[PDB]
Design a binder for this molecule. Structure first.
Ligand SMILES: CCCCCC[C@@H](O)C/C=C\CCCCCCCC(=O)O
Length: 145
C-alpha cells in the first residue's frame, strides 16, 4: 500500500482540478456530505476552495482559502482557521488521509467522488486505521448526499 511519496498536498488534490468528498472522519461534528471543490487556479501558494455540505435537509456552501506548504494545508475563512497535514496519498491521488491538528486531533479520509481504483481506496482505509487505531469512525458521505 505504498502510495505517493513524498506526500504533497497539491498533488494529493489532483493539482486543484477535482472535487473530493469526505468519506470517513473520527470527528463527531464532521459536516454531512462535506465536499471540497476548487474555485479558481492556484494563486501563489494558495488555492481557492468552496466547501459544500448539508445541514439537516438544507444544502450550504462556504468559501475557503487553502495555503499549501508541502503536505501541510492551512484553511481560512474570515477569523476561522483549520490546520491539517495530508499524511497518506494514494498512488494515483484518488484518495488521501489527513490529520486535523488541534487539542484532540482527528483524522479524515477524502476521495474523488468518482468510482474505480478500489485497491487504492482500501489502502487509504488501512492507513486511516493505522493512524487512528481505536477511534470510532463516522461516514459523512453516507448522509443521503
Ligand atoms: C481542493 C478540493 C478539496 C480538497 C479537500 C482537501 C481535504 O484534504 C480537506 C482539506 C481542508 C478542509 C477544510 C474544511 C473547512 C470546513 C468546511 C465546512 C465548514 O464551513 O465548517
Amino acid at each position: 500500500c505504498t502510495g505517493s511519496e513524498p506526500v504533497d498536498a497539491f498533488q494529493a488534490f489532483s493539482e486543484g482540478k477535482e472535487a473530493y468528498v469526505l468519506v470517513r472522519s473520527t470527528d463527531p461534528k464532521a459536516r454531512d456530505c462535506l465536499k471540497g471543490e476548487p474555485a479558481g487556479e492556484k494563486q501563489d501558494n494558495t488555492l481557492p476552495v468552496m466547501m459544500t455540505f448539508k445541514q439537516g435537509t438544507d444544502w450550504a456552501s462556504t468559501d475557503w482559502t487553502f495555503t499549501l506548504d508541502g503536505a501541510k494545508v492551512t484553511a481560512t475563512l474570515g477569523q476561522l482557521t483549520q490546520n491539517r497535514e495530508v499524511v497518506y496519498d494514494s498512488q494515483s491521488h484518488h484518495c488521501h488521509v489527513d490529520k486535523v491538528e488541534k487539542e484532540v486531533p482527528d483524522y479524515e479520509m477524502w476521495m474523488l467522488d468518482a468510482g474505480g481504483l478500489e485497491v487504492e481506496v482500501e489502502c487509504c482505509r488501512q492507513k486511516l486505521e493505522e493512524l487512528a487505531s481505536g477511534r470510532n469512525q463516522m461516514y459523512p458521505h453516507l448522509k443521503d448526499c
